[PDB]
Design a protein around this ligand. Structure first.
Ligand SMILES: CCCCCCCCCCCC(=O)N[C@@H](CO[C@H]1O[C@H](CO)[C@H](O)[C@H](O)[C@H]1O)[C@H](O)[C@H](O)CCCC(=O)NCCCCCCc1ccccc1
Ligand SMILES: *[C@@H]1O[C@H](CO[C@@H]2O[C@@H](C)[C@@H](O)[C@@H](O)[C@@H]2O)[C@@H](O[C@@H]2O[C@H](CO)[C@@H](O)[C@H](O)[C@H]2NC(C)=O)[C@H](O)[C@H]1NC(C)=O
Ligand SMILES: CCCCCCCCCCCCCCCC(=O)O
Ligand SMILES: *[C@@H]1O[C@H](CO)[C@@H](O)[C@H](O)[C@H]1NC(C)=O
Ligand SMILES: *[C@@H]1O[C@H](CO)[C@@H](O)[C@H](O)[C@H]1NC(C)=O
Lengths: 269, 98
């Protein structure tokens, strides 16, 4: 069960300066990058072409090459009619559900706020979006050639492409990397208290279980941090526990993960 | 405008004298223009590698910086961020214990 996301980020500083950059993700692994200063889309995995032939890939890329130029012109022309600086983001792709099913999306943000989506056969402003967008969305919807292309991309190309990625990238998507854990501590705010920290790093895939323990008893004070990326496509997480000084003894951190073969890591404080 | 959050953490368990990698993960910011420096004893580390900038479900940007480092008993490491949301740079120190 995976979500394929193409993320476009465009900054328009004035009528002479703009750039558009994109990154593409399959779940939590980056599959493409497309820098403003590259003519072509870059692969960031060996399998980033999926099961598309070189001809199909080149066709697909050419359309994006045209889009990137047209997009930039459209926005510059729009700002002249209607100011700077302007940030526009697009998030498009599809979510693959079990038994062949999938749903596609194309969402657009202006100045960091979701304003427009493509839905069915047309562009729509979302409720609460500024009313000045209605007219340019009307004009965009008159372009039926663009509408039909976006329909093809969302309905056909996205799920097709992603099926091929899942097959082609199987050994990477299903890779297992073991967490390594360690313990440390800092003083707490209030007197006679300490924050114990269980650090867990290098694990893949993302799902993991980390708890402070007293024997078989979970310590419900366990405060799990956010999932933080390492630079080598593994994850980092820490879990903290506020403890009274001289109540440290008998505490352990326990880590469960798919890569460990049913043998949890247990570190003792 | 959204203010960047900064988290500093090592790739491997720190051991004094042993080469490791220090990560600085910067999140929750907008607009995307940003300057990120990693510092050793207050001095800019030259070799710093950056991921491609990306953004989250909520549209805020994130980026990961990392560099090789060898922790010792006496060296301090930090990550310093300049962004239009803040009048001054924000510095977060690596604390192996935190
Ligand atoms: C993340 C992935 C990107 C998803 C995106 C779709 C990629 C496929 C497009 C292929 C067709 C396209 O490029 N159309 C371009 C070229 O069109 C000509 O040529 C085409 C073929 O070459 C067809 O023959 C057309 O009939 C013909 O008019 C159009 O010039 C098109 O108008 C440019 C792209 C417009 C577009 O979609 N923009 C993103 C949506 C933003 C909506 C407005 C948002 C906004 C506005 C102001 C302020 C803030 C926000
Ligand atoms: C493409 O599919 C849409 C419907 O799919 C939905 O919208 C897409 C953008 C995508 O995000 C999907 O996951 C969504 O579930 C078709 O639009 C429908 O067409 C039917 C049949 O003519 C019509 O009765 C409906 O009104 C349309 N649905 C909506 C919600 O507007 C569209 O025709 C398909 N286009 C092609 C070329 O296949
Ligand atoms: C409408 C987009 C969904 C369909 C995408 C299926 C093909 C994926 C190809 C990956 C290349 C990414 C190109 C990014 C283009 C951009 O955002 O400007
Ligand atoms: C346009 O923006 C760029 C980048 O911010 C800047 O260097 C340049 O001064 C701007 N151009 C004008 C004409 O102000
Ligand atoms: C981005 O790419 C476009 C098209 O190649 C180019 O004209 C523009 O100058 C680039 N922008 C920057 C800021 O480099």
């Amino acid at each position: 069960n995976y979500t394929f996301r193409c993320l476009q980020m465009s900054s328009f500083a004035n009528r002479s300066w703009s750039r558009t950059d994109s990154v593409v993700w399959l779940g939590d692994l980056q599959t493409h990058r497309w820098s403003n200063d590259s003519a072509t889309i870059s692969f960031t995995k060996p399998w980033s072409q999926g099961k598309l032939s070189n001809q199909q890939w080149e066709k697909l890329q050419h359309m994006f090459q045209v889009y990137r130029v047209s997009f930039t012109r459209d926005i510059q022309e729009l700002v002249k009619m209607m100011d700077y600086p302007i940030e526009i983001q697009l998030s498009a792709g599809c979510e693959m559900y079990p038994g062949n099913a999938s749903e596609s999306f194309l969402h657009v943000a202006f100045q960091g706020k979701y304003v427009v989506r493509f839905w069915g056969t047309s562009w729509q402003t979302v409720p609460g979006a500024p009313s000045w967008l209605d007219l340019p969305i009307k004009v965009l919807n008159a372009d039926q050639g663009t509408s039909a292309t976006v329909q093809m991309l969302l309905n056909d190309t996205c799920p097709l492409f992603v099926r091929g990625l899942l097959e082609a990238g199987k050994s990477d998507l299903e890779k297992q990397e073991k967490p390594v854990a360690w313990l440390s501590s800092v003083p707490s705010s209030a007197h006679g208290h300490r924050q114990l920290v269980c650090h867990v790093s290098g694990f893949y895939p993302k799902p993991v279980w980390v708890m402070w323990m007293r024997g078989d008893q979970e310590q419900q004070g366990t405060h799990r941090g956010d999932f933080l990326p390492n630079a080598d496509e593994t994850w980092y997480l820490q879990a903290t526990l506020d403890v009274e000084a001289g109540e440290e003894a008998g505490l352990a951190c326990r880590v469960k993960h798919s890569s460990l073969g049913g043998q949890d890591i247990i570190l003792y404080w | 405008q959204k203010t960047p959050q900064i988290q500093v953490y090592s790739r491997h368990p720190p051991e004094n004298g042993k080469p490791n990698i220090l990560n600085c993960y910067v999140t929750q910011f907008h607009p995307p223009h940003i300057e990120i420096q990693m510092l050793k004893n207050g001095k800019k580390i030259p070799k710093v590698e950056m991921s491609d900038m990306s953004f989250s479900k909520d549209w805020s940007f994130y980026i990961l910086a990392h560099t090789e480092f060898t922790p010792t008993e006496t060296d301090t490491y930090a990550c310093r961020v300049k962004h239009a949301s803040m009048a001054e740079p924000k510095t977060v120190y690596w604390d192996r214990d935190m």
